[PDB]
Structures are given as structure tokens and as C-alpha cells.
Amino acid sequence: RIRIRLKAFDHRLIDQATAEIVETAKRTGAQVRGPIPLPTRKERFTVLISPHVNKDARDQYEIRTHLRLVDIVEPTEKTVDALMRLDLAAGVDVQISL
Amino acid sequence: AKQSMKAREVKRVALADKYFAKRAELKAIISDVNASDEDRWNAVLKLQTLPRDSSPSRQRNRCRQTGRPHGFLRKFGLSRIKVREAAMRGEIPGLKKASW
Amino acid sequence: RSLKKGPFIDLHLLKKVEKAVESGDKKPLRTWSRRSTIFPNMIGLTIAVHNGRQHVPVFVTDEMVGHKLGEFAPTRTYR
Amino acid sequence: RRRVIGQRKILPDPKFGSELLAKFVNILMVDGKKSTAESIVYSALETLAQRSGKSELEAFEVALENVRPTVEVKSRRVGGSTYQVPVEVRPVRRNALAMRWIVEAARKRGDKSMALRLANELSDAAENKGTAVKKREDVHRMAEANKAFA
Amino acid sequence: ARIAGINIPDHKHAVIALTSIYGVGKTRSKAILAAAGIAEDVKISELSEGQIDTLRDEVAKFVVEGDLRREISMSIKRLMDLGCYRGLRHRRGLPVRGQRTKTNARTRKGPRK
RNA sequence: CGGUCCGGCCGGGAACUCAAAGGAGACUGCCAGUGAUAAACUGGAGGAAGGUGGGGAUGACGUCAAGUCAUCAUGGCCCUUACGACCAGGGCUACACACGUGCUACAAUGGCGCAUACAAAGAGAAGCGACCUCGCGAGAGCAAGCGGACCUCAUAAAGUGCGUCGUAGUCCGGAUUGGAGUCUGCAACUCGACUCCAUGAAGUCGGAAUCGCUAGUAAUCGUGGAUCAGAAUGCCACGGUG
Numbered sequence A: 001r002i003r004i005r006l007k008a009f010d011h012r013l014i015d016q017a018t019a020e021i022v023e024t025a026k027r028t029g030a031q032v033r034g035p036i037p038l039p040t041r042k043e044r045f046t047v048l049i050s051p052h053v054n055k056d057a058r059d060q061y062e063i064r065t066h067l068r069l070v071d072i073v074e075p076t077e078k079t080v081d082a083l084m085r086l087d088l089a090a091g092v093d094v095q096i097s098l
Numbered sequence B: 001a002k003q004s005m006k007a008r009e010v011k012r013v014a015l016a017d018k019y020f021a022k023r024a025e026l027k028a029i030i031s032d033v034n035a036s037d038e039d040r041w042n043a044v045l046k047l048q049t050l051p052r053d054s055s056p057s058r059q060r061n062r063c064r065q066t067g068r069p070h071g072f073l074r075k076f077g078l079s080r081i082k083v084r085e086a087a088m089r090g091e092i093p094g095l096k097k098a099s100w
Numbered sequence C: 001r002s003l004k005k006g007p008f009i010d011l012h013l014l015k016k017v018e019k020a021v022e023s024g025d026k027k028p029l030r031t032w033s034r035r036s037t038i039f040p041n042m043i044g045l046t047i048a049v050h051n052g053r054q055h056v057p058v059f060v061t062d063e064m065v066g067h068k069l070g071e072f073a074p075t076r077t078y079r
Numbered sequence D: 001r002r003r004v005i006g007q008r009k010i011l012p013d014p015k016f017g018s019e020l021l022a023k024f025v026n027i028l029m030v031d032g033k034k035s036t037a038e039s040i041v042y043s044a045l046e047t048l049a050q051r052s053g054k055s056e057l058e059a060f061e062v063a064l065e066n067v068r069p070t071v072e073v074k075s076r077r078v079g080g081s082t083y084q085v086p087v088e089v090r091p092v093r094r095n096a097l098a099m100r101w102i103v104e105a106a107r108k109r110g111d112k113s114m115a116l117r118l119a120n121e122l123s124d125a126a127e128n129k130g131t132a133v134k135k136r137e138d139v140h141r142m143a144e145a146n147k148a149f150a
Numbered sequence E: 001a002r003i004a005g006i007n008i009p010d011h012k013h014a015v016i017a018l019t020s021i022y023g024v025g026k027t028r029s030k031a032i033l034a035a036a037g038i039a040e041d042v043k044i045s046e047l048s049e050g051q052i053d054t055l056r057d058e059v060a061k062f063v064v065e066g067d068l069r070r071e072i073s074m075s076i077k078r079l080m081d082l083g084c085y086r087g088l089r090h091r092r093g094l095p096v097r098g099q100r101t102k103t104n105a106r107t108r109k110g111p112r113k
Numbered sequence F: 001c002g003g004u005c006c007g008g009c010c011g012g013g014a015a016c017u018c019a020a021a022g023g024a025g026a027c028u029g030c031c032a033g034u035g036a037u038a039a040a041c042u043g044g045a046g047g048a049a050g051g052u053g054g055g056g057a058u059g060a061c062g063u064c065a066a067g068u069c070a071u072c073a074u075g076g077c078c079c080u081u082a083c084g085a086c087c088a089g090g091g092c093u094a095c096a097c098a099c100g101u102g103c104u105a106c107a108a109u110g111g112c113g114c115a116u117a118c119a120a121a122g123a124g125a126a127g128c129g130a131c132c133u134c135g136c137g138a139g140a141g142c143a144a145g146c147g148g149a150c151c152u153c154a155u156a157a158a159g160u161g162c163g164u165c166g167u168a169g170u171c172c173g174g175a176u177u178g179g180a181g182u183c184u185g186c187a188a189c190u191c192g193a194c195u196c197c198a199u200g201a202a203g204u205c206g207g208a209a210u211c212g213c214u215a216g217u218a219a220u221c222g223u224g225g226a227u228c229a230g231a232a233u234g235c236c237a238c239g240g241u242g
Helices: A013-024 A077-084 B012-018 B042-048 B080-089 D020-028 D061-065 D097-107 D114-124 D134-141 E066-080 E085-091
Strands: A003-008 A041-048 A058-068 A093-097 C029-031 C047-050 C055-057 D071-077 D082-088
Touching (some): A003 A013, A013 A058, A013 A077, A041 B080, A077 A093, D020 D097, D061 D097, D071 D134, D097 D114, E066 E085
Parallel strands (some): C029 C047
Antiparallel strands (some): A003 A058, A003 A093, A041 A058, C047 C055
16 A cells, blocks of 8 residues: 655666566556656756865755655555565665555 | 873763763653742752763763864864874775865 | 853852851862852852962952952052 | 947837936946936936926937037047047947936935935026036037147 | 933924933833833923932932943953953954954054054 | 635635646748858748747866875885874963954935835744743743644744934944843853843945946846754845835
């Protein structure tokens, strides 16, 4: 009866990790929906370009935080069991909740 | 910056999770609200704040690589003295040159 | 400042309550406490308070009931 | 440089249908608070309504008709020397010159409300009766009389 | 008629020459004006003999001027006798506002001609 | 357009917005003119847009062999019973005087009190905190909603409008000085913030002389975050008026 989450920073890894979860969730459930989105976020920051003084010279860094609710059609006991051992590479973050 | 600065957090940061971030929310066990102008708790609470160095205060992250306190930025994961050399090596995930 | 009826003493003074109004026949008691407060009754206790190099002879009235020990122990001299 | 304006366009006053009354609030306003200048325009015209012999719809234009010069004197460098020369006052400035002098006068004044400080200058701006007030125009009277070298 | 003001300007609202001066404050000194029949919005002239008896009734409730300055001055002169940090800083011309005499002590120093 | 947790909630749609991607379109293409008649320019039509469409990213050779072994290493030197580091107390915000820059005002194209119209971008469960109560008040004490896209932080403020006021160092201001407290914390005395009854000064262009850019630019008012046990007016960002 559970619900799922996927969170990342890479614009392609978010889909490659989706394509791991919705397949692990389909291997024990025949009815399909495909992935649902939201929420996406962005963030930018500045730093001094050199380690000693040089405080007028700076460089621009940014990130884009990607998240999917994904949705699972049958969250059945046999299907959540496959998600207790979810691997799925490093570089993303997930949840299982009720 | 000194080699002594690298382990200075070890006891401080541990008591931050243990007591220094909930002891005021749980204070009703070392307090009274029924007796007017009467103390039976101050000397046992001052005994709890008797130890030093480990405080709710005094707490600094530092650059664990050098001991340098200044120029720390949590959004970068690393203090700015080492950021360009680490980020151009590709060591910090996912920092890159892309500019504005 | 800030506190009604003034604060309670430090624990390192709570262990020294036998020398609160009398120092004895000995030299005035050398005190590095400057952040701690005076006893609400303390006259006849002879003390010498630290200034960062030496200890200075301080003067206290029977009417002084709450002051930090540094607040009446000077540190500077002009030029 | 060369590849520059000219004059950028401005939208005429929505109530009067005039581009002079649009430039007027743009130079009158301060700190970009044009909403207060929209309460000073026409509110400063209270004592001019019956007094205007061109009727109310020209009671401000009359103060701009008072002065419409063709040249102004400027002092310009030719080398180790600096001389007075006449420069042309074009149709685009010919109608906006006195408008710029009246707002300076009102801003330099300090009695009553701004809608009354503005009315003090506007009352004499086509009469010119005050003492040492036509010194204002010596920069064009010295230009219609320029001799220079040829 | 006046009750607490001493300055020359006439026909103003019943607060400027009634409150916030020498010791009378503004917190209880204005509530009494309605009992005297005096309004606190817009300039007024209803304070005369008769109305003022409702204000001359307030006795032993407050202190003003030199006796209020005596209260603070003695409350500092008791400390100027002692080796206290603010004792010498009120026996000598020194700041107590936590100042930097390298940059700004201008109120305590003066001109700056 | 039916049904109705009265709700885009379900049926209906995939379009607009809002957030995201990939293309196509602008090429001197087109006319006449100019140009050692050539490169390319000068106007007009047509177009959302015209001439690298517009805007960004990018530092050739050379510049003082710059500032720094105070982030680092790393060759050498000096100290090593210390110039090393662990506590504790004073100091790095001494001052009869100089330099270096901002912000808020000196007001009425302005303030104040009471209404009134409209946000962008961020923050947050040992949290963001809606309320009510005690009280003079900070706040304490309990606590709705919410797991952070149908909640909280949050009446955006300036502006608009009404009431009110002057050339008075002012209705104002409340800078300063004690006394009370409120918070966080061995600890705020000294160097912290918030509050209240009281008191009370400065500012009405401002030295010789000089500073800076071409439009959403200058000018000007609010909102957010970082640091953080506990404070900014500085640091990084957001939108309104223009």
C-alpha cells in the first residue's frame, strides 16, 4: 500500500533512475501508468576564484535539483519487497512511505 | 593553520546531538511551576552547565584539511581555499565550469 | 542588569561560603573571578582581584549586593 | 559616438492628449514617484484657469511660448584657447527649453506645497515682471549677437 | 491656559504642550484630558480656568525637572564614589555607549567646529 | 458541459498559463543607390525581429619577473629545558587626531494615524508557527495547518486616498543616561538583541575641490536567504515605481 520518491541533480540520471524504479515496480505488476513528475528546483552560488585575497575575482556555480513522485500502480507486498533491496546506483536519493 | 584544529570538534559535535538541541524542549523534568518564589533546581542545572569546551556555543565546522575556520561554504561542501583545485580535478560531485 | 532580585552565586563560590565575610589574619584573598558576582553580604572579607598581570586591592560597601567582580576591579592607567 | 539617439518616444497624457504634458511630469517627478507628479500637474493650474487668455487648455503652453530661441552660447575649446560659439536650438528643444527652467525654479523654492511652489513661477513665466529674472535668457540673447571671428 | 507647557506657540492640539516633557510623560498625562472635556485631535482652545481644576487635582503622583534629575544624578553619584566601570566614566569625561574613540565619540567629545 | 468532499473534485481536455525540451524563421533574402563600383555600406518594403538579430561564454604575444612559504606544499635558516600547545585573566572596538566609504534624515513632489490595490524569489519537525492568555511589553505557556505545489514564515512596502501640519532643531526625532525587565547562553559587567514607564541632544546642503553612465539604465521602497546557542545597516539574491 506504500508510495515512492526519487530525487537527483543530473538531468539524465533522473530518467535512468526512473527507468530502474518503474521497471522494478512492473516486474510484479502488469497494469501501467508511466512516471509522474514534480517538484523541480534550482539554486546558484558564488565563490572567490583564488585561495588568497583576490576578492574582486569570482566564479559562478549552480545546481538543478530534480524530483519525481513517479507513482506505483500496484504497490503490492511482493513489489515493495523488490524495493527494500533497491540498487540503483549511487548519485540519487529515494523514500518508501505509507 | 595548525594541526591541532583538525580534531577540535569531536566531543563538541557529539553532545550537540545528545543534549544541546533538545534539553530546553524537555526542561519540564528539572523545573517547577507550582511553588511561588522557591528554588530547588538552579544548583543542579548549573551543575549540568559546569563542564566546558563542549557547549551549545563554541561550535565551528572548520576546513578539516587545513584547520582554517574562515571561508567555509556548506553549499560547496569544502572551504574556498581548496575549492578550485578540487573542482577542476573533478573531486566534488557535481561542481563544474559552466559560468553564468 | 536583566535579572529580578539578582543572580545566584557560582558553584565555585557555593563551596567558599566560610570565607564570605572574613578572610582571617592572612593576606587578602587572591581572586581571578571577574565574571562571577559578589555575595549579597561581604564586608570584612579582604580580597585582591586580578587585572591581567597583577592583583589589585578592591574596595566594597555594605550596600553592594550584586556586581560582577571585574566591574569594580580596574585594568587601565592613562598613558 | 555616432550611432545613438536622437529622441526616444514618450506616450502623451491620457487625460489631455498632449506630449508636452507627458514630458513635463517626467522632468517634474522625483525618485520616479510619477503618481505624486500626476497630483501636482493641473493642481498647480488652479490659479491660472480664469487668468489664461488662451483659455485653460493653453494656460501652461503660454509659459513655453514666452521663450522659443534658435541659438544658445556655449564655451568651446579650439586648442590652447577657449571661445564662445553659437550652437543651434532645434525644433525638438525649441518647445522644451522653458519647461526645464520652470521646474528648476520650483525645486529651488521652499514655501507652501509643491503645487504652490510651481504656481509661483508659472504666474510670472509669461509676464517676466520680477527683478533679475531675465538673466535666465542671457544665454540666448548673447547668441543672437555672437560675432566670434566670421 | 497652560498646565505643563512653557514655550510661546499658540492654538495647537492638546498633546504637544501637554505630554512628553520634563517628567509628565505621555501614558497617563493624556487620559485626563477627556475628564477636563478637552479633545486630543485638531487644535483646541477649551483649556481654561475650570477645565484645569480637573488637572490641578493630580498631586503626589509624579515628579518633574530638577527633582527628577536629582533622582538619576544621585543614582550615579553613589557609583562615582566607587571603583566601578561606570563610576569613573561618570566622574571623568568618558563614554559608556561602548564607543570607538578612534572613529566616533562625537556627542561625548563635541566640536568639530 | 453532466455529476457534485460543493473543490479542476470525478467525467471532459493536453491546448493557454506555469515549468521543461526539440525544431523552423533572418539569408543582404529583395529593389534602387554608393563603393579604385569590390569587400561592404545607405534607405524602403515585408516581418515578432535586419543587418555579427539581440545577449552570454570566452584573456593570443607582451605588461610589475606584481601579492602570497598567513590555505598550501617545498629548499634553507633560527628556537627546541622553547619563539612549541593546554588552561585562565587582560587585550586585537586605548586616544587631547587623521584617513576610507555607505545608510537614514535634515521634510510637505514629506512624514504621521486610519483605511485600501497588486508580488517575485527563498526559508521550515529537537521546525515554519496560525491563535489566545498574563502584562506596560519583549516574551512565556499551550497550540491550528503542513511535510514541506490546495500550510506556516505573510495585511509586501512605497504608491492611491482621507484626517493633520510648517519654514519653528518641527506633530516630529528619541541620538544619549539611569531603573526595570524579555531571550539565548558557564557568561551578556565588559563588547549582544528585543521591550517599557521616564528624561533628552544633533540634523534646516554640507572645506579647498571634485565623482559617475546612455534605459528597465540612473533614481527610489519593500521581500527573502546566508553566518547562527544567541544580533547587522555589511555579503548574495527578489519584485514594485521609474
